[PDB]
RNA sequence: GGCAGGCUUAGAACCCGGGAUCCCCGAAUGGGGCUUCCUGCCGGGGCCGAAUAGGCCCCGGCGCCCCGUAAGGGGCGGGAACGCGGGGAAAGGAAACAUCUUAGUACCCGCAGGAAGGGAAGCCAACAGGGACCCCCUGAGUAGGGGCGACCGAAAGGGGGAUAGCCCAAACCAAAUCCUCGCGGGACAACCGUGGGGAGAUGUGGGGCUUGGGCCCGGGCAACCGCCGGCGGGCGGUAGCCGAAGUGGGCUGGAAUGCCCCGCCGUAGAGGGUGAUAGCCCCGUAGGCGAAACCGCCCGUGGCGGAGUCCCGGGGUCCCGGAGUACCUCGGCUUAGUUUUGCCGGGGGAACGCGCCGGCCACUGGCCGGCAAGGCUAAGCACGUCCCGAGUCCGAUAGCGCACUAGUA
RNA sequence: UCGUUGCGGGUCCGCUUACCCGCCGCAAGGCGGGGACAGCGGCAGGCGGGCUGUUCGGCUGGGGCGGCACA
């Protein structure tokens, strides 16, 4: 939307923060172990209820 | 008493579907996994049909009398070389059965001592046997705390409580040491099979004359 | 060693006349002013009181006279005072809301009867019997499986 | 402080979750016989400066001194007890503190003394 | 109050041309209170402060100094250019 | 002081399947009485003071009056009172209660020894 | 299990005890809240500004219902299950089904505690006696209820766990009373002196509690009954510390804990790790020691108060002894309760200790047992968020939905 | 029908304070009308598919109608 609430901005401001996947280095260190984020989501697929 | 879960495989919110979508009408999905099958024995994640209850009997009551008559009947049966032999003991150095000591054993209050009675009284060699027999057993035993199997060596009689030769001879391997009043049938015939070399004290045998009968 | 009362089990007309003795609760006054005692000194000594028994039995009486001598010839350590040690009343938070004000009792039943035979007790001993399958609600029907059985083959 | 539990899930669960207090207990090493007569304690945890004998695996026989201690992995790190990777650096065996004779004891912390003290009385 | 300053290339071209800087403040924190900040922390005149909330939920404020002041003089004397 | 209307409660009829026993209204009442219903409310009035007793006053067509009585726990002059301090909590030290019940007990066998012990004897 | 840079021997990391910080929403409590954000009044402070104007910002207070003279104080929400009061089904069973059962259950509303509730004879009995209560075994599927069908279903008594008894009101005296605050004293307390205020004759306080009491008289202390928790000591919990005996010779081996040979400890051969299978390599085990601080329990001592309220003897025939209660009738729910359980509602409605209540329909007589309609009460009993231990339990499609960045995506 | 339900007078008449209805007033209270009726609670009879639960047997040249070959 165009017009929003604070509040509503924020938790989507909370939701762009979080979606990126581990950094390279947390592969190394864990031995590629730790791959993946469950944060990790995409604009068109998962819709966040916000 | 051994169980499972009252809930395990029933708390999912399962609903049979009917017949007409072409699938089997056992339990499914109601959300968003709705074909996955569910509670039933026969499906991934469903109930045990038949699990082990807690209030299951697994105790075996015998009759006072019974019980009685049975350990005066192991008592005797380690009065026979056949027997002890039989169950398994070394006996070719024991001289003689029931092998009987002097109430003067129930003083020695180390193991190092105790040792040498064993091994003066023909009594060392089962003990050798049940050291060198103790075995990694298969299974998985292992993992729930049974990991060793060491067999049965000698158990011996002392006349009453808290005497010092119950703390002397209690590490070795396989041998047991009780109290002449709290004689039972998990040492007298261990396995169910009758026969074991027994190391009495005299006072011991004179107190057995008023038990078991 | 303490002495412990001895009272009569009440004889009942089923008995038919066999009588037999039991424990009492406690030793009764007559007993004790035979001894030189009232209940309060009793019940410092340690001797448990029950001053709602009238009967006076000889046996209660001699026990309690030579277990008095060994106390008083100082051969014996009397027990602590059968009286109240503790003091603990705790705040009470809606009594009114709980029912435990007098309208609330009298609504229960314990005015005009006992816990045991009132509602709410019935209710909650039928429920603790039928949750741990207890003795006869380990069976439903017992009584019917029963005297149908006893029919057939007592025929 | 490791469960006295008999079951092997508990006694493997403490430690592996073991705080660091506690995983110094694992370090313990036998000390030699001249250090025996030496101190009059017969077990100090490993430190960062004692010169040990390796006593089993594929270097054994070898003395060095240690280099590295781990708290996490509980392993040490010996001299001589080396190899080089495919690119050519010198790298170091990991090994448990239960496989090595302290044969010399690195004194200079003040804090060793009094727990030195304390294990010979 | 201020929690670092923006030195990307939209700012720098800011302090060149119109005398501003660019900080990162508390997102409760009001225009009175960033130009009260500012004129105490370093000793310079605010003219105007604008302020966004940025989309990563932070809030920047455009202080526009007093024409005594220079912007990017106040950045590589901070050491933060 | 409590003014409630009398009758029985307000039973509710069923909007749903019922067996015939289970769908009357006329008649049905509370196992709840008024009193205990005017103890209640008066104690929703004045929270946090305890409900000691009630009493019915007066009756007329429409409506019954009680009297609730009601104290404060957290005043200082009711938790001293030897019947308020039922209500309100009480607590002695063990070591109050056992410590003269002793000396009792040590001065009594005392007395005894002196007194009762030769007329048990003889 | 990475890359750097640091911290740390001036004693870090780690663990235990005590503190600090603790954004917004949240019982949320200044007021709103269609966006966990916004906004008002008062008081203080700050800033822009020529300005004490005006504006903007920070900080504190401002919920409802109550108790209290005021000062001040209380309740509100949460917790896995358990506890108490009320409202309250159906499916199914009966081989249909309505009474009935399911079941006073599921579920809902309200209210507490670490347990709750119950608890101290207007009892049970049967002419012989028990002696508050709860919980366990039994009595017992007995009595009894019931389309006398399905089915439902006690109590007394006996054996145990544990054991504990008291108060309010009244008779009689009549302000001798209690709360608060100031000051002086007093183990930081209670309490004492003094003064102000508040409650109180619509009765504070004393006394009384079935071994009824009040009232009158005489004797005795082992009087009795309450309040504070200071000082000392002991013990336990919340971190830890000490703890015996091979890393001996040879073989296989990448590596030994394995094999052969030789030793040793054992109050310790419970169990785990270590490069394969270890009593003696290490952790631990038998066994022993331990806390600046916080907590909990026990013992000794210490400090106060009261109207003799305590015990024993006699006299008494005067006084007190709990109301819409007991009881009757009608409707209804419930109960084994049946012409006889309990209760709620409508209507009616006592007596007084020379009285009243119960003894399986009612009444009459006898006999027996008791004193309702006021309050409290440890112990012994339910539960499992949580902690410790155990296991003929499962072993990654099993076992909790989850052995894993699972109530996650 | 029992209670609410009272006060005078000779079952009937009257009265107002109960109660009810409206107006005014924040409330306090006043004004008007009805009136021990009404309304309300309990109990009792009637009408009551408005709503709740159920039953609508069997044999059978398939079921149904018929018949009873159902005793
Ligand atoms: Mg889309
Ligand atoms: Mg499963
Ligand atoms: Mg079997
Ligand atoms: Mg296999
Ligand atoms: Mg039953
Ligand atoms: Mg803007
Ligand atoms: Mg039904
Ligand atoms: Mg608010
Ligand atoms: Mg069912
Ligand atoms: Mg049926
Ligand atoms: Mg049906
Ligand atoms: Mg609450
Ligand atoms: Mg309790
Ligand atoms: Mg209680
Ligand atoms: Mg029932
Ligand atoms: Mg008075
Ligand atoms: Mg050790
Ligand atoms: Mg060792
Ligand atoms: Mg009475
Ligand atoms: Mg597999
Ligand atoms: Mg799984
Ligand atoms: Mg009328
Ligand atoms: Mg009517
Ligand atoms: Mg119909
Ligand atoms: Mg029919
Ligand atoms: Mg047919
Ligand atoms: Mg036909």
């Known amino acids: 939307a165009r017009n929003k609430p604070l509040g509503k901005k924020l938790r989507l401001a909370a939701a762009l923060n979080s979606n990126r996947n581990p950094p390279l280095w947390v592969i190394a260190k864990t031995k590629r172990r730790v791959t993946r984020s469950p944060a990790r989501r995409h604009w068109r697929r998962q819709k966040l209820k916000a | 008493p051994k169980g499972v879960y009252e809930g395990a495989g029933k708390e999912h919110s399962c609903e049979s579907f009917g017949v007409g979508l072409g699938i089997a009408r056992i339990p499914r999905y109601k959300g968003h996994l709705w074909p996955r099958g569910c509670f039933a024995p026969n499906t991934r994640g469903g109930r045990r049909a038949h699990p082990p209850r807690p209030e299951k009997k697994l105790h075996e009551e015998i009759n006072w009398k019974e019980k009685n008559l049975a350990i005066r009947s192991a008592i005797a049966a380690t009065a026979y070389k056949s027997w002890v032999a039989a169950r398994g003991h070394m006996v070719e150095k024991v001289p003689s059965l029931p092998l009987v000591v002097s109430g003067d054993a129930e003083k020695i209050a180390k193991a190092k001592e105790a040792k040498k009675l064993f091994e003066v009284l023909g009594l060392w060699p089962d003990v050798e046997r049940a050291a060198e027999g103790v075995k990694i057993r298969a299974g998985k ?26 703390g002397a001879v209690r590490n070795f391997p396989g041998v047991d040491v009780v109290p002449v009043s709290h004689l ?3 040492v007298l015939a261990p396995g169910g099979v009758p026969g074991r070399l027994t190391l009495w004290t005299a006072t011991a045998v004179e107190r057995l004359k008023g038990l078991f009968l | 060693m303490i002495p412990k009362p001895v009272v009569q089990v009440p004889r009942s007309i089923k008995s038919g006349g066999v009588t037999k003795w039991k424990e009492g609760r406690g030793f009764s006054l007559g007993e004790l002013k035979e001894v030189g005692l009232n209940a309060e000194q009793a019940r410092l000594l340690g001797l448990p009181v029950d001053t709602r028994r009238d009967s006076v039995w000889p046996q209660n009486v001699e026990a309690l006279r030579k277990w008095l001598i060994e106390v008083l010839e100082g051969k014996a350590t009397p027990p602590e005072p059968t009286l109240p040690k503790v003091v603990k009343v705790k705040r009470k938070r809606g009594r009114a809301f709980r029912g435990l004000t007098s309208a609330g009792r009298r609504s229960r039943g314990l005015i005009s009867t006992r816990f045991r035979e009132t509602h709410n007790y019935k209710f909650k001993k039928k429920a603790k019997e ?3 399958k207890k003795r006869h609600e380990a069976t439903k029907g017992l009584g019917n499986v029963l005297r149908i059985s006893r029919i057939i083959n007592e025929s | 402080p490791f469960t006295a539990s008999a079951q092997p899930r508990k006694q493997r669960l403490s430690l592996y979750a073991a705080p660091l207090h506690l995983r110094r207990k694992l370090l313990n090493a036998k000390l030699s016989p001249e250090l025996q007569k030496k101190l009059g304690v017969k077990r100090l945890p490993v430190r960062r400066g004692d010169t040990v004998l390796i006593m089993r695996g594929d270097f054994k026989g070898v003395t060095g001194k240690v280099v590295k201690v781990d708290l996490k992995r509980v392993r040490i790190f010996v001299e001589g007890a080396t190899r080089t990777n495919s690119r050519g650096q010198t790298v170091y065996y990991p090994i448990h503190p239960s496989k090595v ?10 804090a060793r003394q009094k727990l030195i003290e304390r294990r010979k009385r | 109050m201020i929690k670092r300053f923006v030195i990307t290339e939209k700012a720098l071209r800011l302090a060149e041309r119109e005398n501003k800087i660019t900080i990162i403040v508390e997102r409760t924190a009001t225009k009175k209170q960033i130009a009260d900040e500012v004129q105490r922390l370093y000793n310079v005149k605010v003219e105007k402060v604008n302020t966004l909330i940025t989309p990563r939920g932070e809030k920047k404020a455009y202080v526009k100094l007093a024409e005594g002041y220079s912007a990017m003089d106040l950045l590589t004397k901070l050491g933060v250019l | 002081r409590v003014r409630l209307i009398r009758g029985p409660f307000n039973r509710r009829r069923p909007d749903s399947g019922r067996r015939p026993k289970r769908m009357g209204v006329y008649g049905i009442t509370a196992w709840k009485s008024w009193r205990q219903v005017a103890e209640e409310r008066a104690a929703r009035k004045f929270p946090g003071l305890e409900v000691l007793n009630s009493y019915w006053v007066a009756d007329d067509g429409i409506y019954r009056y009680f009297e609730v009585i009601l104290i404060d726990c957290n005043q200082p002059t009711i938790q001293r009172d030897p019947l308020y301090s039922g209500i309100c909590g009480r607590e002695v030290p063990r070591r109050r209660l056992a410590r003269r019940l002793r000396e009792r007990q040590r001065k009594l066998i005392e007395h005894l020894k002196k007194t009762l012990l030769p007329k048990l004897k003889g």
């Open chain 2, 184 to 186: 039972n049938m998990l």
């Open chain 2, 141 to 166: 035993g292992k993992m729930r705390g049974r990991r060793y199997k060491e067999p049965k060596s000698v158990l011996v009689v002392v006349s009453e409580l808290d005497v010092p030769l119950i």
């Open chain 4, 101 to 110: 004779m302290i044969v010399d004891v690195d004194l200079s912390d003040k």
């Open chain 3, 130 to 132: 039928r949750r741990l």
